[PDB]
Structure of Gamma-glutamyltranspeptidase:
Amino acid sequence: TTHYSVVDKDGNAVAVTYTLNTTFGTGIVAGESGILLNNQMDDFSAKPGVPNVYGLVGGDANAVGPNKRPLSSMSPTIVVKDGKTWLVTGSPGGSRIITTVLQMVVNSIDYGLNVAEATNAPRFHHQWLPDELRVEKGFSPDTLKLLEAKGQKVALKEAMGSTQSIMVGPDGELYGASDPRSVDDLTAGY
Amino acid sequence: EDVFHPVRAKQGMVASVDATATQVGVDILKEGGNAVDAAVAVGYALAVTHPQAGNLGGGGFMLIRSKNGNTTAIDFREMAPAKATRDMFLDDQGNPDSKKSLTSHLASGTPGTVAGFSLALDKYGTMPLNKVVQPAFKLARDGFIVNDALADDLKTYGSEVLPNHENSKAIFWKEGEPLKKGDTLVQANLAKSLEMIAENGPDEFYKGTIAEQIAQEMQKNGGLITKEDLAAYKAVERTPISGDYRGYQVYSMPPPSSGGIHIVQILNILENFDMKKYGFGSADAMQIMAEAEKYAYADRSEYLGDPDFVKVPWQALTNKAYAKSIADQIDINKAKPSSEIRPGKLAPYE
């Protein structure tokens, strides 16, 4: 999955998240078309109560069906401040997309972090099942100790997401941030 | 005061996972294209420079907000083949086989990206498809240098699937190994596909030569996507799911995506706590959010699906009173095991 954001000189904004699902999808090119084929079907619930590649589960609602669109977690998002487009964000990450974007919004609104600060801050995640509080490297040992005392089952795992965001200033000025988790990416303007 | 500094610009800006694609988007803006024009150009460029996820053979979502405030969502999520069935991924014993849903030809849904980009470009853009596809076309035809990101991905994830298919190996593998950083990746077949799309429009993908190539790849290898599937695919413009968090309005994707609903649901829950007070990286803030998240994911497992097939109780799920009922269950000093959490009872909020 990959997400990108755009804001033009007139103030129009677009947030796009698209994907083949896993990296390179099936890894299958369609004949001589040079086009790689997705493996999005794994986003359906193959059997009630059994998890998919992201640990997500389902039942009737997200069951496989002809012509049906498999449930996604993709969250291209725009936040409005004072009636104007303020934050344009999104991110890849399967089940983690929801919490990654959620954190960008919280970091921006509740903690008043600038777009780069919100982007470089560490991320955590809990998706109910599995029952574990997933965290990236970056949280204080004092904090993780308190979480464990509260009953959380802390699990240190791989970095989560690749946010590509743009914040719009009250004067039209643009502020952007690519993710430290993704090398060779870029936020640029004019 | 800041350790982290954002990139700054006064006119336009593009943020993407790939430098080349970003520059493509910036050039389009500089040429006079609007955000949608640039967004489509970036999408086609990534389909060439970021084969890991950028694509023509996958799907996705687009959120568009005009300078006038008009906010809308474009659903170009893949559609399961018409021959798909509820138990298609189960083995003879009735247990799901991840190989079938992740590495076989049965794992693919009918691609929606081309359809989605054209729906958006035609209604909200200003440039013709050929103009926004051109940058991608040149990159595929003339090639580009493999960087660390692509080299790493080809070696790590690519090794598991690309070399197992002749046509894929012929493009991404070299001298028996994945392309290395510094090598040049030329994609002549993709260039042809791009050229035909630019000349004949999206129909080339859903009804033309590309469609034939997809249908044949499937027919020959036990796949299900047929020409009928491709001809029947359609991107769908849908009303965004949105909420209000401390006076800020949040817009995101509606079903078939669960993202918008749960981001709004969780923010609704969090609104009941003085998050700013706890602060980033505090045990209290993390505790509250982790707990809130559990309820949302439990709800996701039961109520979310393609809205054209099932009625999604999005109103109840994004109802602040419901959010309040969950917030009152959160003990900032004691986590509630997932075994004690089930999908909520929405009846009183519908």
